Amino acid sequence: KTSFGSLKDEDRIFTNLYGRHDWRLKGAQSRGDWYKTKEILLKGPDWILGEVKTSGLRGRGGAGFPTGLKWSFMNKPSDGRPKYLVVNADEGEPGTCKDREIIRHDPHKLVEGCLVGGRAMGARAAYIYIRGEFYNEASNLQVAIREAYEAGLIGKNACGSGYDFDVFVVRGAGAYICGEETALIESIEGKQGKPRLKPPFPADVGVFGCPTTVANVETVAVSPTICRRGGAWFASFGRERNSGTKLFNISGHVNNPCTVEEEMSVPLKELIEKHAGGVTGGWDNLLAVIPGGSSTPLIPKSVCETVLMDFDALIQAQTGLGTAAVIVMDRSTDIVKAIARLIEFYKHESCGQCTPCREGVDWMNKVMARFVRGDARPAEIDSLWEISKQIEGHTICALGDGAAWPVQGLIRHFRPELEERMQQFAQQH
Amino acid sequence: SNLIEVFVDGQSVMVEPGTTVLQACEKVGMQIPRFCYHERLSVAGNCRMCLVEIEKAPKVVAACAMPVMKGWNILTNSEKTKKAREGVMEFLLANHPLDCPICDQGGECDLQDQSMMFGSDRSRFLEGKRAVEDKNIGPLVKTIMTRCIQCTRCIRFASEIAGVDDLGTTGRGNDMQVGTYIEKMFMSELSGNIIDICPVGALTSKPYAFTARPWETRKTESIDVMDAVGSNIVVSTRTGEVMRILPRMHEDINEEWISDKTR
Amino acid sequence: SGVNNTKKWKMEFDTRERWENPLMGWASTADPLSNLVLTFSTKEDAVAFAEKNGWSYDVEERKVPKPKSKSYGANFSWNKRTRVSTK
Amino acid sequence: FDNTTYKNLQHHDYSTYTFLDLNLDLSKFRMPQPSSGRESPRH
Amino acid sequence: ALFVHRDTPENNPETPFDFTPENYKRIEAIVKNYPEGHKAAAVLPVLDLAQRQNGWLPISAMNKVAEILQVPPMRVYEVATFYTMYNRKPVGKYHIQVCTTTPCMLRNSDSILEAIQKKLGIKVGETTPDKLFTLIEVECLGACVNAPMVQINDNYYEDLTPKDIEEIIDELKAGKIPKPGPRSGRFSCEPAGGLTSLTEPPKGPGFGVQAGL
Numbered sequence A: 001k002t003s004f005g006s007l008k009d010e011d012r013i014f015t016n017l018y019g020r021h022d023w024r025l026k027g028a029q030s031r032g033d034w035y036k037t038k039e040i041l042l043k044g045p046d047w048i049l050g051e052v053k054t055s056g057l058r059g060r061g062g063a064g065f066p067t068g069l070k071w072s073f074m075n076k077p078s079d080g081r082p083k084y085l086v087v088n089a090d091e092g093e094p095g096t097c098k099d100r101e102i103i104r105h106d107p108h109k110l111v112e113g114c115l116v117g118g119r120a121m122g123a124r125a126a127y128i129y130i131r132g133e134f135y136n137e138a139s140n141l142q143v144a145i146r147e148a149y150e151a152g153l154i155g156k157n158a159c160g161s162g163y164d165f166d167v168f169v170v171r172g173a174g175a176y177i178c179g180e181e182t183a184l185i186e187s188i189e190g191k192q193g194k195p196r197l198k199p200p201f202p203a204d205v206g207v208f209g210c211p212t213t214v215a216n217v218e219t220v221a222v223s224p225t226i227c228r229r230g231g232a233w234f235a236s237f238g239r240e241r242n243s244g245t246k247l248f249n250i251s252g253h254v255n256n257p258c259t260v261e262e263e264m265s266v267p268l269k270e271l272i273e274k275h276a277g278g279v280t281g282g283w284d285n286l287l288a289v290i291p292g293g294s295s296t297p298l299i300p301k302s303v304c305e306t307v308l309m310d311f312d313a314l315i316q317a318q319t320g321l322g323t324a325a326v327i328v329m330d331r332s333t334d335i336v337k338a339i340a341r342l343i344e345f346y347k348h349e350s351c352g353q354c355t356p357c358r359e360g361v362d363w364m365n366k367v368m369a370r371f372v373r374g375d376a377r378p379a380e381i382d383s384l385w386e387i388s389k390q391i392e393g394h395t396i397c398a399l400g401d402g403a404a405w406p407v408q409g410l411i412r413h414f415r416p417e418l419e420e421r422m423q424q425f426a427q428q429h
Numbered sequence B: 001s002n003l004i005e006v007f008v009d010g011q012s013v014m015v016e017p018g019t020t021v022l023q024a025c026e027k028v029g030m031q032i033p034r035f036c037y038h039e040r041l042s043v044a045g046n047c048r049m050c051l052v053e054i055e056k057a058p059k060v061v062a063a064c065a066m067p068v069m070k071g072w073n074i075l076t077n078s079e080k081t082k083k084a085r086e087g088v089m090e091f092l093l094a095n096h097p098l099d100c101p102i103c104d105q106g107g108e109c110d111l112q113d114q115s116m117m118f119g120s121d122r123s124r125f126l127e128g129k130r131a132v133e134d135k136n137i138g139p140l141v142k143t144i145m146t147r148c149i150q151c152t153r154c155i156r157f158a159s160e161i162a163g164v165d166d167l168g169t170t171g172r173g174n175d176m177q178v179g180t181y182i183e184k185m186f187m188s189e190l191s192g193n194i195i196d197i198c199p200v201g202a203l204t205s206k207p208y209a210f211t212a213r214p215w216e217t218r219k220t221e222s223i224d225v226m227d228a229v230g231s232n233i234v235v236s237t238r239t240g241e242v243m244r245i246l247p248r249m250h251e252d253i254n255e256e257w258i259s260d261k262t263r
Numbered sequence C: 001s002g003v004n005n006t007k008k009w010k011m012e013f014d015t016r017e018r019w020e021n022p023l024m025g026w027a028s029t030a031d032p033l034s035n036l037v038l039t040f041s042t043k044e045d046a047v048a049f050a051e052k053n054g055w056s057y058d059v060e061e062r063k064v065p066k067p068k069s070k071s072y073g074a075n076f077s078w079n080k081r082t083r084v085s086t087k
Numbered sequence D: 001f002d003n004t005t006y007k008n009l010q011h012h013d014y015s016t017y018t019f020l021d022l023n024l025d026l027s028k029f030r031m032p033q034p035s036s037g038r039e040s041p042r043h
Numbered sequence E: 001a002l003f004v005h006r007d008t009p010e011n012n013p014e015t016p017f018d019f020t021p022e023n024y025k026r027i028e029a030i031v032k033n034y035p036e037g038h039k040a041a042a043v044l045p046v047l048d049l050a051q052r053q054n055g056w057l058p059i060s061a062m063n064k065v066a067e068i069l070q071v072p073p074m075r076v077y078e079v080a081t082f083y084t085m086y087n088r089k090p091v092g093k094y095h096i097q098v099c100t101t102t103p104c105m106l107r108n109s110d111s112i113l114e115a116i117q118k119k120l121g122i123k124v125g126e127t128t129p130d131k132l133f134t135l136i137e138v139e140c141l142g143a144c145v146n147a148p149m150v151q152i153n154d155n156y157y158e159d160l161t162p163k164d165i166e167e168i169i170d171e172l173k174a175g176k177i178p179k180p181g182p183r184s185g186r187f188s189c190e191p192a193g194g195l196t197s198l199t200e201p202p203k204g205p206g207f208g209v210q211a212g213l
Ligand SMILES: Cc1cc2nc3c(=O)[nH]c(=O)nc-3n(C[C@H](O)[C@H](O)[C@H](O)COP(=O)(O)O)c2cc1C
Pocket: A058, A059, A060, A061, A062, A063, A064, A065, A088, A089, A090, A091, A092, A093, A176, A177, A178, A179, A180, A181, A182, A214, A215, A216, A217, A219, A220, A397, A398, A399, A402
C-alpha cells in the first residue's frame, strides 16, 4: 500500500473507545476480550513474543522502541528473583488522553494484556501505575480486576492455564515525571519520583530490584488482539516499521476535539479534517501543530500539508510522533506564549535531580517569559538555542530532552516572530 | 585473567569487570571532574560534571556511574567532552551566589577550581538568582544553603556512613532543598565530616568561621589522641596558632573521617 | 577532591618556636629553615639529597587510595543492605 | 444494539474510599507475596 | 508554598492524628500488595489514605505513616513535599483545580479561571472565608480533548463554559454534588456533532482470529 487512513471499524481494536457499550466483563467478552486466552497462554512466551515481533508493534508511551525486542529482554532463565510487568498508566504528557479512555471504557483489554504480556515476560504479577488524578478511572479498572479475579481469568491458575498471575493497581500522587519508566519504578518503591541512571536496565534490576518491564497502557492493551488475530494482521496497517493502528488525540483549535483510532501513517491533514471537523476557521487558518504531545517540536502549516503520522515520517519533519497527541494552533494564537507555557510546565515537572534540567529548564523558562513580552535582544535567541543543546543529551532522563525540543521547534520555525516581538518592545521603550 | 582491555585517550589499560569509566581514567593518572561522586559513598550520577565522550558513541556518559565495556576508547579531552563540562559548569553557576569573598570555602573550593580548569571564563546568565533560607542543624555545622549545588553528598554520607536518615531533599525542580524539613539538629559523633565532603561553602565549620584562608595555613600531619583509634589528622596552623583539625587519609585506620571530638 | 597536590615527594624540616612581636603582635621566628620546602620526583631522590647535606631524616611511605568496587545498580538491591532509601 | 447512551455511569456514585475498599476486597484473591529474606533493608 | 516545616499550634508533632480502625484494615491490604521486606512501597498509598481521612497532612500524620511502616520520618517528608497532590496545609471542602496548560489554554481555560474568581471572590491559591473552596491552577490533567476542564476533589468537569462552572459551584454551595463529565452535550471524548468511527456494532468473540489458536 501507499495510502493510509480510512480504518474500518472491524479493524479497530478499541471497539469501546467512547463508552457506549458495557465496559464491565459481560460487555468486554461480548466484544471479543478474554477469548481463547488459555490457548494463548499455553502457546508459550516464545510464541507470544514471536507474534509481537511479527506485528511490528512499537512503544506507544512516546519513545517508540520495538516492543517485541524489548519484551524479549525478560525471556531469560530465573535467577531467583520475582519478575514483574509494570504498566505505565501515568498518562501525563500534555495533549495526551488516550490511555484514560482505555482504562475506563476498555479496562478488560488492559487486564488481559497484562496477563498475556506478563506470560511472555515470565512475570508473576503486573503493577499498573495510574496517575492519582485519574481516581474514577482507577476505580473502574479496579472493579474490572475484581470481575477478572472472580471469573478465574487472573490469579491462581489463570484462565485454567496453570499460570499464577496477579494484577495490582497503585495510584500516583501528582507528578508528570513519574511517567518516566525508572521514576515510575522508584515511585512504586515509595521514594520520590526521580529517574535512575542506566545501566542497570530495568530488565536486570527494576522494581524492588528485580527483573522488570515497563510498558505503556496502549502497548499492553493491544497485545491480546495481536495474538488472537496475528502479528501479520497488525503489520498490514501502516508503513513498514510503522505498523498497526494508533489512538490519536486532536485538541486545541479544531472544531470537534476528540479521541479516535486510525491507521498509522495517515496524513496529518486527513486526520484533522476527517475526525476533528477541521481547523477552526478553516485549514488556511492553521498556524502550527504539535504532532506528538508537548515534548515534540512543533511543525508549521507548510509542513503539515503532507506529513504522515508515523515515527519515521515525523522524524524527517524534524519532530516526532510521540504519544500521537495533536495540539492544533490556529492563526490567532500567540505561538511564543503557547510554547512559553509548555516550558513553564516542564519547569514545574522537573524532578530536580540532575543539574542541566534542574537549573537549565528554569533558566529557559525565564528567558521564554521575556521573549513573550519582547524584553530581550536578538542575540539572546541564539543564546537560548545553545542553552537548550546543553540540556538535551546531558541529563539523566528524557524530560530534559522534552524541554529542549519545544524551544528548538519555536526557534526553528518562528524566529521572525520572536525578533519582531523584540523590535516592538524596543520602540515602546 | 578476568581483566578486560579498554582505552583512555587511546592508551591500553586492563581493568576488572564493573570498573567505571571514571575509575579507568584514574589508572592512567587522569582525574575526571566531579561534584556528586565520592569514592566512599554510593554512586549518584546527578551533578553531570563527569560526563565524557566514548569514541563512536553519540551520547556522553556519566563516568562516575557507567561501567566500561571492552574495547571502549574514553575521550577525556575531546571537544564533545570539554563542551559538556562547560555547559554543566554554566548550569551550576547560574544560581550560585556571588559569595566567594565572604564564603569560607574560597581558596579551597572545588566549584571555584573546577570552574577555572573546566568551565568558561564568563557568564551569559541575565536573570535573577534563586535564594534559599538557611537551616539550623546544630552548633558545629553552619549552613548557607544558597551555595548548595544539590550534590546529595551530605545526604548519602549521613545515611550510609553515619547511619542517620535525618537529611534529605524536599520539594521539586529548581526549588528542591536539602535539609531536615523540620527543625532538627544533626548531632552525630561523625557529623562534622559533612563539612569536608560538601564540595561548596554550603556546610562549614561554625568554630572555624571566618578565621583563616586555606593558602595561609601551614599543614602539620599528626595523630589524634582523643581516643585510642589513632586517627590520622592534619593540624592547620597560621602564625603560630592552631586554626583547625582536618582528617588525614589512612585506609587502615580512619579512612578520611574523624570524630567530632577529634575535629 | 582534586589529587594533583599528591603527586610529588616533599622534604620539610621540624617546626620551631614562633612568638608574638611585642610591638605589633606579628609572628616572629629565629628559624632560618621555617619556610624551606623541597620537591622531589621520588623518595630516593629526596633521601639522596638529605644524606649528602647531612640532615637526619624520616621517610613516610606514600599513601595511595585503595581501589574501590563501585556499582550504581547496588543502590536498588532486592535483598541487600546497600539499597538506598533516597536519591 | 444501541450507540446513543453513555454506559459508564457507575462512577457518579463512587466515594472517598471506593478505590481502597476494592483493594481490600481483592486481598483474598492475591497469591502469597515473595520475600526479600529480611524485614527491611535496615535489618 | 514552602518546603520547610515550622511548628505552629495547629500543626505540630502533638497535633492529634491516628487512623480509624477501618483505615487500619485498609492499610493492611495496601501493605500486603508488595513483597515482604519492601514495606516502604506503601508510603504513597498510606500517606494518601491519611489525607483522605484527615483532608490534609499535618506533620503528625506524616510521623504516623513513618512509624506504621518503620521508615525514617525524613523519608516520608520527602514524599509529602515531592508529590503535588498531598496537602501540607488545610484546603477547603472543595479543592478546585483548573488546568491551564497549553491545550486547555488554547481553548480558553483563562475564562474558566476568571469566572471562578469572580464567583467566589478569591484569587488563585486562596481559600474562601467560609472554608468551602480552595482554588489553584494545575498542569495537564489528561483530559485535553475535553478542554477547558477542572477537577474538584476526585471529579472532572469538562468542556466548560463560564456559565457551566458557576452552575457547578452553585450546586456545590447548595450541598448538591454535581455530575462529573462534559457539560457541552457529548458524553466523553467522541467528536461532537456525530461519531466519525465505531458506528457499526462491534464484532463478537472469535472474529478475525488466526488459524491454529
Ligand atoms: C517525562 C517523561 C514522562 C513520560 N510519561 C509517560 C507516560 O505517561 N506514559 C507512558 O507510557 N510513557 C511515558 N514516558 C515514556 C516512558 O519512560 C517509557 O518510554 C514507556 O513507558 C515505555 O513503554 P512503551 O515502550 O510501551 O511505550 C515518559 C517519559 C518521560 C521522559
